[model samples]
Target: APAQQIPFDFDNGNFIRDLITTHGGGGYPPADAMAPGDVSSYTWVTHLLQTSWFDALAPYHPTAVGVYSRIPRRPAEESATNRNKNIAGLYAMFQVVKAAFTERVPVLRQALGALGLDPDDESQDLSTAVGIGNTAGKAVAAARMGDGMNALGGKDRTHNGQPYEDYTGYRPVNTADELVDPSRWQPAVEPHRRRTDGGPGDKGIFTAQRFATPQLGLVAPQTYRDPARFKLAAPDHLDHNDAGAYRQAVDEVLAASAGLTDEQKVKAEFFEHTPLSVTLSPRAAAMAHDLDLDGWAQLFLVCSTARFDSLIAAWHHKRAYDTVRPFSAVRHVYGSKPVTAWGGPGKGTVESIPADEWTGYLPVGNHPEYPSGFTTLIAAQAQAARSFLGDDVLNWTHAFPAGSGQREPGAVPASDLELTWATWTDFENDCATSRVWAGAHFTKTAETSLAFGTQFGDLAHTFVQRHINGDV
Candidate 1:
């Protein structure tokens, strides 16, 4: 015999109204807005709520939430400032609730109907049901809060500024410890590499590499590698020779396009948006102690913007100068070599080479090579993050262990905003250089791609800003 279903008894409408009022809506400024010290605190609380709902409900949903969580709420004492506290708390609570809805909605609906809840009650909207569940959950949270408050012996009355010591004993795990361990993690693997067949390709767009390396006049040290030559001939390389050519080109284009009387350009330059996007790499997410969904969304949005810009710019450049990849050019010029057999260790057959020995510079993307997507995405994301933070300081850091050769931990930070800009500029430069590394792209083509990417990024930044501002 099956167990009897219990009828769900809760006023979902009231629950929704309470939740809306508690969060940001219902004509109330966010708690953080009212009290700066409470920012982080509020963020954390809200995030917990959001996530709880999602976790409770996601099993039934078909779609998965894509964004990663942001750094957890720091200790109250650590967040001495009210603004920080407010932001942190608000972020946390918001995330928990948001994740709950996004991930758990299907399961929740099914559970409610199974429990004999009125599935046909139009007043009990999905939001209402979740809201009621969250409201009940909040009671449990409040009891926990009360226990801490009681332990403090009436001194810990303040919500945001209350010291961790004053509240019930709570301690934070060190972030460094969380990041160092690899056994507790699963990381994203680079997708499989593809190969191309040797053949005579089309002209103009698919020309073979023609430039020859100039003979080194004198023998140098074994470590002394000859400088890679420019793609174009000497006359065309004059721009490369110009010490300030890159800067000058960027400045000139920005200035000339400054007064273009176009709506697109104007909109792209402005940066006025509340709750700017936060970005996080996969490793960074693992390190976070109290991750929030909204923060994750913000971060994902920032990263996605960079990726989209890269894809779009790559497409534009490929269309502008249908260039061939390095492998094809190398095969055309040097003659076909045996197709490098490659795969994993055990996966390798007699035809297979070691994975490390597998040869290829760029993946087999269909678009022509110019401004590399890798470079473009990095630059766009960096720029957007800078714009969002309203700080030129590129003191941001990312952790990439698996991708950095072995599982070696490494971190890089921008010394300053200008240096950050230069760093991205270097990424574009490196992408162009990589063509030479792979013996595929001509110096001319690489240089041209760099120029195109810079311009495209600038344009994209401006355009995104405008769209955000509702100016476009």
Candidate 2:
């Protein structure tokens, strides 16, 4: 047979980006809907899409099975080509994406049309490739429709039809204005362009933080079921009992800010999203490893599951600890005392600023500060990549153009810089510590989250492999 062409470069990655860029609605929102900034909610969308790809490709594989719904396997001869795999995977993803973001159905249909496929082919017959994919995708979507995220405002009425609303009844112990309890999480008054009541193009307004998706910790995991089992104990130092430890932690963040080198600052901004870390890095490795369509789908599913479950685990610990963020903690300890730190956007280091007026380099997250969610997600992803590749070896390097960073723009990198991670450990470590350098989290939060996330990564690998090997 001649060399076969797979027709299209895989867009599973771009699809994930669309989920974020489109504000979780796949770029289509109804009037007056609040745009979501939380990552955990988006993780659920990515997991569903990636898992659908796996389920869609499963029937074409000799021994593979679907995690959510097992369709009858096809003949071995059909598995010899990428034809069945590509068609099935696309159809599967189309179904899941359309269901996940129902408003984006027309766009999804347009995408399927671009591939010269029919969007109306709603066949669920297990005998054909289309049916197998459609059935499996629908199965996964249906199974998770109400998995405790309140995705459609059905779980709680007070949300008033807003999706992904927090029904956890998690009120902060301290208001944004006053930190009556230094140990508890304090909301931050941040600026936002769109208010909940304003239209899409509205101007900015100052709003206090309402916890972002507090219900995420309770959402049912697709792979690692018992997230509560890994819940972390409260950080004793943050409690009123240990003033010294608390002050030391605050000073650590201040010190890190005071001494931010150009390289470290770039790294802090880079890892904020770490576009090259989790999703893209594995895909890059896949290209080098020469993965077929099914192989790509499997790798994506496994890694995405690790990310999702890690987030659930991280959220579990975050809610359990509910510790104060650096901003509040620093203010509480140093109130009006002069401190040296990175002054704000482009301010550089200042000799003396009132501690009460000090803020982190990055905008604080809406949630509590215990376990760093992004670090946890990155650690799980790197570990999953290592597990999939059968080693920790990764020869990945990402180059950033000067001023391309979101936080400091062209000012930080100075010139083009390349970040290389020779091993997954290096990647994970960089991701873990970057949070501290950004002043988004304490050192222990990153460290603990790294270890906690690795557990979910391993579990995700085991869970996905069982399905891939038909052991489930």
Best by TM-score: 2
- Full-model lDDT for every candidate: 0.29, 0.75
- lDDT (10s digit) by residue, model 2, range 141-258: 8888677887767776743577777778999889999998999899998777422122245356688888778788898887757788786756876775699999988989999889
Q: How would you encode candidate 1's per-residue C-alpha lDDT over 402-451 as one tens digit per residue?
A: 21211111211111111111233333354444443332334455565444
> Once superposed on the true structure, which residue ranges of model 1 sit more than 4 Å away at CA?
1-303, 336-358, 361-363, 395-446, 459-472
Candidate 2 clashing pairs, residues 3+ apart or interchain: 403-409, 403-410
TM-scores for every candidate against the unseen true structure: 0.32, 0.88
Q: What is the lDDT of residue 333 in candidate 2?
A: 91
- Scored by lDDT, the top model is 2
